[PDB]
Amino acid sequence: MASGEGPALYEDPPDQKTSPSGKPATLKICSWNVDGLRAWIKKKGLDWVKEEAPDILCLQETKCSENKLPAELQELPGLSHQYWSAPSKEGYSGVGLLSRQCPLKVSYGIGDEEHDQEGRVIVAEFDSFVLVTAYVPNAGRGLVRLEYRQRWDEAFRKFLKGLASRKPLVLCGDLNVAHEEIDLRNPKGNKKNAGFTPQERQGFGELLQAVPLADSFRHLYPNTPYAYTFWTYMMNARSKNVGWRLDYFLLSHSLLPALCDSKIRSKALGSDHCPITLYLAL
C-alpha cells in the first residue's frame, strides 16, 4: 500500500551554550545508540565524537562483549575513563560510558537481578550529579516482550527515584519509546508497534511524574515537530525524515536552571540513530 509520508524538514536550532541565568555551559554530554560498536567505528563514529568533543559520551547497543573491545577506543585520549556493561551471552544490547574526568563511582544495572543480565545500564556518580545511561528493552516484534518491558519500566522508575532522592540525576540513552504523537512521524500507524504502544507511552509519563524528571528537549522545544533520533534503515526512512524520537536526556527538576540546550545531531551518520547532545551549566 502507498506510503503517505514525503520529506519533512527539521533543522536543529543552533547550540545555545548559555543558561537562562547567563552561565556558560560547563558540561557537554553526548548519547548515541551506535547499532554495534565495531560497525559504528568502521563508519567513522569516533571521528564524529572527536569533533563533537563531549565531556562524557554514552553509547547504547554496543553489541560488544566487555572482553572484546575494539582497540580503536584506545585512541580517545579526551575520554580516557571508559566503562562498559554487556550481557552476562554476546553480540546484543550493551552500553558504554566514556568520560573525560573520572567518576566518583561507577555501578552497573539497577539493583534488580532479573533486569541486570542484559548490559543495559551504567551509573556514573560525579560531584554535583549522577549520570545514568540506559538501553531500555524493546517491546519486541508482535509485542512479545511488552509484558517484560512493563516490569522493566516499573523497576527502572523505582531505581531512578531512589538515585534522584540523593543527588540530581541526568538519564540519557535509548528509552525505546516515542512519548507523544509529536515524537514520531507516523503515530496513527504505530499505536500497536513497539515504541508507541499505550503501555510504553504511559510508562514514560509515569517515569517523568514519579522520579520526577523533565524531558530536556521537549522542555526547550515544546511544540517543535519532526525532531527524531531514529529512522529505520529500510523504506528510505531517514531521507524522508520518517523517524521516531527514542533518545532522550531526562533531568531532575533542580537541573533545569542549568539547562543550556538539548540537541539532536540529525546529520551525524554511522547508525540508524543519531547522537543527542546536552549542554549543562553545572
Author numbering: 36 to 123, 125 to 318
Lines quoted from the article behind this entry:
S6 Fig New structure of apo human APE1 with a focus on the remote binding pocket. For this model the resolution cutoff was 1.25 Å. (b) The same view of a model that was refined using the same diffraction data but with a resolution cutoff of 1.40 Å. The Mg2+-induced NMR shift perturbations reflect these conformational changes, in addition to changes in the chemical environment near the Mg2+-binding site. Regarding APE1 conformational changes caused by the binding of compound 3, superposition of our two new structures for apo APE1, free and in complex with compound 3, reveals that binding of 3 induces minor changes in overall structure with some significant changes in the remote binding site for residues including L62, D90, R136, Q137, F162, S164, F165, and L318.
Mammalian AP endonuclease 1 (APE1) initiates repair of abasic (apurinic/apyrimidinic) sites and other toxic and mutagenic DNA lesions and performs critical roles in base excision repair (BER) and single strand break repair (SSBR). APE1 is the major mammalian enzyme for repair of abasic sites, which impair DNA replication and other processes, causing DNA strand breaks and cross links. In addition to its AP endonuclease activity, the exonuclease activity of APE1 processes BER intermediates generated by bifunctional DNA glycosylases and removes 3´-blocking groups arising at strand breaks.
